[PDB]
Design a binder for this molecule. Sequence first.
Ligand SMILES: Nc1ncnc2c1nc(Br)n2[C@@H]1O[C@H](COP(=O)(O)O)[C@@H](O)[C@H]1O
Ligand SMILES: [Zn+2]
Ligand SMILES: [Zn+2]
Length: 338
Amino acid sequence: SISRFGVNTENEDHLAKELEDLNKWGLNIFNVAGYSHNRPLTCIMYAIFQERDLLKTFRISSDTFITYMMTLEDHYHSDVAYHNSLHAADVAQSTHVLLSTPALDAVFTDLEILAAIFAAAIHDVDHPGVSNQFLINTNSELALMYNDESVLENHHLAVGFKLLQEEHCDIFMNLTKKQRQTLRKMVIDMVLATDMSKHMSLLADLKTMVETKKVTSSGVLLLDNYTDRIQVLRNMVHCADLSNPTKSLELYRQWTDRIMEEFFQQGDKERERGMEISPMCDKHTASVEKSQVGFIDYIVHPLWETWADLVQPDAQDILDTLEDNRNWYQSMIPQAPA
Ligand SMILES: Nc1ncnc2c1nc(Br)n2[C@@H]1O[C@H](COP(=O)(O)O)[C@@H](O)[C@H]1O
Ligand SMILES: [Zn+2]
Ligand SMILES: [Zn+2]
């Protein structure tokens, strides 16, 4: 309902043009936010749920959905440069595209599709713009509550679900009790998996699976048991979360400026509070280009090559873009050795 969005017909027409890419990696979520009064997460999520008939399937009225989404989106901090609703919207939409990869056709149930997109939407909700370590080092009440383990990730989950109890926000009201239980389990699993400290083990397990990889006569992947599906789902959301470098350079560069500003912001907070300045959080000693190249080589590329392997040749264009983007940054590195 365009009215809940406060969008007039002219921006609705702009939005319509942007949403033509709803199912494409090339969608520009920045333009989406620009035409939706900066409610990219609710807009994109509504478009996604309509596109996949998830509202009909799970009996979620547009009212309940929009109410919950606008509430959730409002719990993302618009003053946090990277981990805001724009990033959540990007990850939800990226997850939406990844779910429809040829190699995974007919593999996931609707509840699993619902879980993955929900997970993506709430995975960074109420993010303060600082790392778990910063929260730990400052003796944050949040760190004490979660015993220094996956502090933010646990909090993102607690908030995403807690907001279902606000007025007209229970979008899972009509799922059976078993459905809610299963979705909760899967969502918790996928969001906890976004904790970068679990990356290596996620990748390790992911490779170990690409080995026993099974397909059909048409090439479609075969995932018959839960453990395997959830493992693919958790890695999928992780990949979407780490998809910035695989996007058109125009987009990637905007994501990089944001993550760097957020790091510098934390750097400022550490200086303000008399703490030692963390790595990559000092704008006067950080190498943006070197960082990206290093991030891609050791984290992003190793992840996406493995995902591309699992669903080959579906992710080939993504891998090519990733590699082009990496080399572009490697060339932009300030002309050393002098
Ligand atoms: N261009 C980029 N996009 C996403 N994360 C990046 C990044 N460059 C770097 Br360095 N990172 C790091 O990778 C982590 C990924 O976690 P999130 O995507 O959830 O933010 C970031 O928190 C940040 O520490
Ligand atoms: Zn996160
Ligand atoms: Zn994220």
